[PDB]
Design a protein around this ligand. Structure first.
Ligand SMILES: Cc1cc2nc3c(=O)[nH]c(=O)nc-3n(C[C@H](O)[C@H](O)[C@H](O)COP(=O)(O)OP(=O)(O)OC[C@H]3O[C@@H](n4cnc5c(N)ncnc54)[C@H](O)[C@@H]3O)c2cc1C
Ligand SMILES: Cc1cc2nc3c(=O)[nH]c(=O)nc-3n(C[C@H](O)[C@H](O)[C@H](O)COP(=O)(O)OP(=O)(O)OC[C@H]3O[C@@H](n4cnc5c(N)ncnc54)[C@H](O)[C@@H]3O)c2cc1C
Ligand SMILES: O=C1c2ccccc2C(=O)[C@@H](Br)[C@H]1[C@H]1C(=O)c2ccccc2C(=O)[C@@H]1O
Lengths: 270, 270
């Protein structure tokens, strides 16, 4: 029912802004309740600081952000801007991340949003890691625009596999917190695209969003395959290790196991 | 003879600050000229904006950061803070990036530093990308500290291969600009390390820096293996494609070619 669009672009004149508006309008049309987070427009502070904890710190002499931020969440003393974003996430069923690819990742303003908003207990638990994480009932999507062509990001392109680039965001940030990660919306070489083709990209994104919730998510190795505790080193179960010995391919981009990475692990489902 | 230490930590009480001081002292002792970039202390602005261009914009109606930033570099009207950092880089032979791992990547403040400082024509060109790029005569190192243990980042750990996490920074940011990327200094689960062991870590980092310049850099596929033109799609040369058909392993993490990733591609040189 509810969706949150997080946008990491400065210009209203950009294709990224167009893609945000396309999504918002498409979803609203299909009966969704759409909430935005235009990070630049919000003049969002992306830097984690002691200013994110409203009152007195627990140990001001040796400030440690994870410890202090959790305490601030639990005691209700987080910075109001963080709290507002946290309330937006709690509410949302679908979370869309609309951004241009910058230095083979998320723009610094989005990275800062994750660091400041995805606080301990709220977003993650060392116990409730990955598929067990807080956002297990939510679904996330990355809608990316790149300057480089798709062939550059193919297995034989100079930049190398796009699946490798996506892994730290999709597994490390999103899946880590519980999210079911849906296929990314990859819009390559947008600067080279003529006007009519751009108008089509938008129509395609809108038609996708008509049934985005019914889609099958990307594959990540289930937490059930690992002995989750410090004594075991959070390693794959010895039984799973044995079962996988006779298997031709790895499980995911990170769990490639020095075997082949299953084709488009981070780009495609099934 | 010149070195630059870029530090992405708020607290002087941190092990990251200790590691910065350790490096600075070690290098200075071995006759190096050491310059710092304590991003938090500098109160560095990590957000790319039109405020990064002091002169008249080319198209203020449709602002495009890459195009305008290059023009500002060439015409000499980039933001003085950006210029100061650019002058530091121009001077440095060795560049050390001291930071805690945050959300499987660089902290937002460092990410913003790359986005705002690594401007087109200064840090890279279309022709001068990867080996045979502007910083080809420089060497870069990542000194990372993590909360999670090394086993979590092993091929069998929950987070998966650390080599996959490193790839977008080491290849995508550093090697893309010509830097020879040296073996990363990975300091795992630093919070759990006892005092005597923490001392040993610092002493080891200092002893490494005694002969850091003479080290062999990490392997990245040379640009000479690819037909770097639009007609060809920036793909590997037909002869390279064929030669690498009978080879068990891929070239790198990103150039895995659907085969096995060579062990510790992004961690070791062998
Ligand atoms: C610091 C930095 C780092 C970067 N790193 C990378 C990298 O690692 N990899 C990479 O591949 N690229 C990289 N890039 C390039 C970047 O990914 C692209 O420039 C970006 O994705 C372009 O998208 P945009 O929203 O800015 O579009 P724009 O360039 O602003 O817009 C594209 C076109 O769409 C048009 N448009 C706008 N609205 C609409 C609409 N409603 N309907 C139709 N057309 C519309 C515009 O008028 C324009 O002609 C980097 C750029 C920067 C600034
Ligand atoms: C937003 C955020 C995201 C994170 N994401 C991740 C993630 O993706 N993966 C991950 O693994 N971790 C993650 N972490 C954890 C983070 O990487 C670590 O907590 C961090 O690396 C700890 O290093 P530190 O510099 O902060 O040292 P500290 O927190 O200060 O601890 C180091 C210890 O060494 C002591 N010490 C200080 N100076 C010296 C000295 N001179 N000699 C000896 N000992 C000294 C200190 O007193 C302390 O006991 C995240 C943390 C944050 C804040
Ligand atoms: O910003 C860019 C970049 C920066 C770092 C790594 C890869 C990249 C890219 O993919 C290239 Br295409 C580059 C941009 C780029 O340099 C550029 C310069 C002048 C006009 C337009 C552009 C772009 O739209 C490009 O996106």
């Amino acid at each position: 029912r509810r969706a949150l669009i997080v946008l990491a672009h400065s210009e209203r004149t950009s294709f990224n802004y167009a893609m945000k508006e396309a999504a918002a309008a498409a979803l609203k049309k299909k009966g969704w309740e759409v909430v935005e987070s235009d990070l630049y427009a919000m003049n969002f502070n992306p830097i984690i600081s002691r200013k994110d904890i409203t009152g007195k710190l627990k140990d001001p002499a040796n400030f440690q952000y994870p410890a202090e931020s959790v305490l601030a969440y639990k005691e209700g003393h987080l910075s109001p801007d963080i709290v507002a974003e946290q309330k937006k996430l709690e509410a949302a069923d679908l979370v869309i991340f609309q951004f241009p690819l910058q230095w083979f990742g998320v723009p610094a303003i989005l990275k800062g949003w994750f660091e400041r908003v995805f606080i301990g207990e709220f977003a993650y638990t060392y116990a409730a890691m990955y598929d067990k994480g807080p956002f297990r009932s939510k679904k996330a999507v990355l809608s990316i625009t790149t300057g480089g062509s798709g062939s550059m990001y193919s297995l034989q392109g100079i930049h190398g596999d796009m699946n490798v680039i996506l892994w730290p965001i999709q597994s490390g940030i999103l899946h880590f917190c519980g999210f079911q990660v849906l296929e990314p919306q990859l819009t390559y070489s947008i600067g080279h695209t003529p006007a009519d083709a751009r108008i089509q990209i938008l129509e395609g994104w809108k038609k996708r969003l008509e049934n985005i919730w019914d889609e099958t998510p990307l594959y990540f190795a289930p937490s059930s395959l690992f002995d989750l505790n410090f004594q075991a080193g959070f390693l794959m179960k010895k039984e799973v290790q044995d079962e996988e010995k006779n298997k031709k391919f790895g499980l995911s981009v990170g769990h490639h196991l020095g075997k082949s990475i299953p084709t488009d692990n981070q780009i495609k489902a099934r």
